[PDB]
Amino acid sequence: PPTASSGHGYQCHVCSAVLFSPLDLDAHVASHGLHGDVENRKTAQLLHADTPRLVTWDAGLCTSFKIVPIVPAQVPQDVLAYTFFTSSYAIQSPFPEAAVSRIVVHTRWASNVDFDRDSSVIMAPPTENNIHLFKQLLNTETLSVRGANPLMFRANVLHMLLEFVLDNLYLNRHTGFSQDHTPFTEGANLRSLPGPDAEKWYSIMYPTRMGTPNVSKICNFVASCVRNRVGRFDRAQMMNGAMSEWVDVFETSDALTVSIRGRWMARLARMNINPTEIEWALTECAQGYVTVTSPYAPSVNRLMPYRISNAERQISQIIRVMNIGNNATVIQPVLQDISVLLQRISPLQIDPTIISNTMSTVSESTTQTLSPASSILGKLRPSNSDFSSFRVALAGWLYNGVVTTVIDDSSYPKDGGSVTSLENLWDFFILALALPLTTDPCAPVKAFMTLANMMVGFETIPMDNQIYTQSRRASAFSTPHTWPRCFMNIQLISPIDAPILRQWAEIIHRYWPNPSQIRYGTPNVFGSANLFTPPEVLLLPIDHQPANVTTPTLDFTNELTNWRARVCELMKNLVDNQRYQPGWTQSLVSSMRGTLGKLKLIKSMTPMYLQQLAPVELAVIAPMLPFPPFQVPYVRLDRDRVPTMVGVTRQSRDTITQPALSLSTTNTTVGVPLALDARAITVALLSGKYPPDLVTNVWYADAIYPMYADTEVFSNLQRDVITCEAVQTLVTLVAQISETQYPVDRYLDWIPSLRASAATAATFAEWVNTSMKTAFDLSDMLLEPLLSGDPRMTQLAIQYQQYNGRTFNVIPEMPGSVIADCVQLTAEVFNHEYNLFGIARGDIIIGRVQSTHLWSPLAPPPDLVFDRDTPGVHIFGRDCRISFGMNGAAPMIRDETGMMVPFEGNWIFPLALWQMNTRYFNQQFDAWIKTGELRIRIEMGAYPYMLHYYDPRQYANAWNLTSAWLEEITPTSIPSVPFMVPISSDHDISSAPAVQYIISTEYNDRSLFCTNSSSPQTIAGPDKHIPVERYNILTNPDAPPTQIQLPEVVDLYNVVTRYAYETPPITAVVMGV
Amino acid sequence: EVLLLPIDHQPANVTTPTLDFTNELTNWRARVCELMKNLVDNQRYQPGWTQSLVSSMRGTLGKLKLIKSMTPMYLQQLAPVELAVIAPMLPFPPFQVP
Amino acid sequence: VALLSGKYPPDLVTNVWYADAIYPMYADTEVFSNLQRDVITCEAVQTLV
Amino acid sequence: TVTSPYAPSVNRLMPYRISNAERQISQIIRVMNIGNNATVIQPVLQDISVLLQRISPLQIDPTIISNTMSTVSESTTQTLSPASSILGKLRPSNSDFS
Amino acid sequence: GYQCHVCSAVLFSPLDLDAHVASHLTSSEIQRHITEFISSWQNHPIVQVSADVENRKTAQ
Amino acid sequence: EHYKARPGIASVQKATESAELPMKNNDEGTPDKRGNTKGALVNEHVEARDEADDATKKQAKDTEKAKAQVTYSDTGINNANELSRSGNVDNEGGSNQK
């Protein structure tokens, strides 16, 4: 198009010439040197999805628990001198020298990671409050800051466990060792970890090296341990003067996160590859045009995580087609990218001068108004640029499964043509050349009914109704139900009445271009992502026979020249008859069927190019694409075998479970038509030439080299990994709270939770999505194609339906998942160790105990705990009413069994009854719990707790805590449960009356670590030594290393392996030439 | 003792599939979407469409069929018990014809 | 549009929501005055005829 | 579940028991009150509508339809497309569901 | 601003350029005959539509 | 107090006190103590049509929108026989011109 306008600018800097417009100015300057939105975000996501962060390292130790002191032990006292304690010498003890020590869960508290993942679980010691961790998720209605919904504990706990796992995904890094000079160990190598602080760490990491001066509990334990298991005991060095590849060290580390990182490492070791097969894959994707070189020497154990599986490729392909259904604005720039990427490569150059220089040869008589050659020229208009229309027509062959490139309305003869006219004949010629290059399954019948529109009144055929007659426009025949029966059963076209529609139907049924194929890529390094075709195969609507020679030149033995020859000879047959157009001069008829003969005998190289070279180009482009080819099979002229749809599923339908049974009725049809000009395709087919003396191997060996120097294609496979892992862990975590179809185990039934609806499941799935996007450093969409339906019953499948009704479906079997393996492992070990994350099991009993004994309320004696099948216990429930007393008689309450009972004895409440009557029960009950003989066991399954300590030497009442708790219990929230538990003492103390109210039911004192921690014994309090059952590798000489008792204890000290691999980029290792 | 309703009522159940074809209104929407799919499918009733819109039509009808609407579940379960709660407190108590 | 769209709140409990919705509407009941009004209406119809 | 406590007394009188005959005759009189007058029927129906709106758990937003229909800004670039057609026909930016 | 190739008329918007080129095959005598035929049958009252009532008040 | 009402006790009581309102008294067409009807001297069909239009305008004004969705007039159904009570007639059957 013209562009220049009246501008405001002048003064070229050379030649001193001032002129009209800046758009003429800059061309004048250049001659001196020459002659001397959801849719846009989906589009950007497909064009370049965000690559994730797999390799993240952890220098420093690998734990997830810590040992925190609570109350300090008395270092000055009057029963034992200050010279006994090792605090008097500043000896750095491996454990907090305090009075009561408890272990809490800070996520690792010690790391030196290079890439932090913003995901952590930090817990205060239980004297402080830990309720925001359990009201974090979906308490958008809770008024009080201290309160949290008890009917929504399990979703909080599952999000915390997923949060904990998504933090603990690192690789343990080998740092550097130093041989000991001190006589504490027997010359064992220590581990040096980086950081500004290192003074505490050589006593925190290695508890089995310290002096053992006295009979303190720490010294008893350390001298009971076994000496030789210190630091490194194994290394695997493969080079002289280089870093060791992997070592094995003894240090403090819990088996939980050691096993989590071990499973993650096994996952990446499954992902691993090597540059020899990188070279092989790039070579056989190049098909010999590009050669790269890999080294041949002893390596240093490079880690490249790139190899993934066919199941993950197919699942990502299904999710991406599900993403791009029914838009076409996410589709157009992909085909623009393929068109310009093909323009950078393709050897031919479309020159419009060939058709004009051969149509200037015609011999007409000029005493005539009608000019057929000038009609050709003014109709085709060769002189325009931009045959990206032809390149997009060539690019749609890759992506027919969602794209149907059809011929535009505007290249049709305007509501029926006549064969007596001329421009309608050239309309038919343009269409008869351009229609074989489209992926429309109705292109043959559109060509035939274009001819049947162009002849009306001359020949008649029997159509099948009176809606789609012979005068109906050919563009409206875009559905295989609308095909004429007279087209297939050809005898209904009688060869006497209609002999030209007879024989043109014979041209279509015989000489239309046959589909064929070609192979591309490899499935070895990167898997094959296509699913309705066999792996590594590419389908083409025209035949492909490979070229023999590499200096190409003309011959006429290909299907497109056969097709053009048949079209031109039938147009000669059409201009032959004097019956169909009597008004023509006999000179002009023969002379300008000579034009049709010469146009049949034109020289052009586009047909040989489409036969021989462009399939090789599509085969070498197609592995290097962000959107892999998605194909349904090409059928030439078969009403039985055309595809009518293609559809993806994202949720199950009903109680039915199996996806092959739930798939045929629950889908979303995808696909969109595209419009193309037939004129540009026709002139690009009629005109095309090579550079004048070319050699193809040199041409392609130059052209294909930078797009294989690019290495973007390897990064999409990690995104495919995390997409498949995310959808699997989504359905695994939703299956815990909702009754779904997949077989899972569940360990968290004892935690009470909500009767979950679809909105609850959708919200919980949104939080899981946000957590996995915050980890791994992603920002584009993930699981958003699957949050549009119900997250409860989900499935991933696809099918296309052939015209007869025979459906072909693909259900990819979901592969394994290290992330859900670690989440289920964390759930099971939480089921056995619930106390460390703040949860207590069982229930509580509210009742007055006034004694001087020092038993801990987290471990009560069994004489004080009653249950359901205990004599003299009333069980309350549905029928609960309260009648007032009158004239001194005691008021009473309704039993579940319809009985009346006074305010005395042992009762059992569900928590929901107390919540639904939380204030009316207070005025009736609280006067009797404090001073009377009433005792309530509120059953509630799970609860967070706080701990308040007291001196056992003084008086201590608990009503100011328990009354505040009972008053703060709300229908929608409860606060934490406060316990009042004494302080362990060293020496003999006195006894004071303590009055406790809230006691636990079963054992919840697992979080205790040690009592008095420096004293030779513990007198008059709760007693616990250093847990020997944790430190198994030290205290048991018979137990070998790598012996984890993981599902019941975490052991806090074991062997851990440490790696010193390197992850170089692919271009830094293998390179071309 | 009765209140005549123009639809079916079931006992109240928070957890049930939002895609559930036992439900009357969900079944009705599903069958109307399926008949309009059968109407569009063959392109017999629509000449003059110069483009094959049938793929996009069946896609958007499938999208309208498979939706997370909780209104049919609500009218099936919780709206009738809400009407039964609201009904005998009205100033103009109800007057129904079968 | 109201049939095709509509969701529950993501932490719904029927017992809590319905007790809290049914309590103040029964606190403003007035049916007893309606019963007395129906008494006087029927007595006035019979004495009218 | 309600409860109503009371002390035992005989002289307490709260007159509130009618029979179905009176309860039906007054209903017939209230139906004869209407008499094809549309202002008699309007505020009862609208106020019951608002009361159901304030009690009802179901909140409604058409952003579900707007998120399922991904096609936006098509009506002036191409003449026809069905997702944009049904989006502009349902008009999800209205929020009067009376 | 864009311009036409016949008669070199410069315009501003591309749709107006398309309208100008569309305002711009057969021999010159035949275009003269076609234009004279269409100008003859242009405003004849056989093509025109959507007229008005007359307020007759005659022709009883 | 610690509990926040989730449907909102002020909102529910604000709605139910508007639902609590009794029926409008339609005395039109009934005699007074003197012996005259209490109407507007216009016939019954036009009174019914005018009255339905007034109630449609009231329904439009009640919500904050200007144009009403739910209407009582020009509903697409023929109701040319409907006539609501006015004071053009008397109890005898004659007219009430004087």
Ligand SMILES: [Zn+2]
């Ligand atoms: Zn210059």
Ligand SMILES: [Zn+2]
């Ligand atoms: Zn011009």
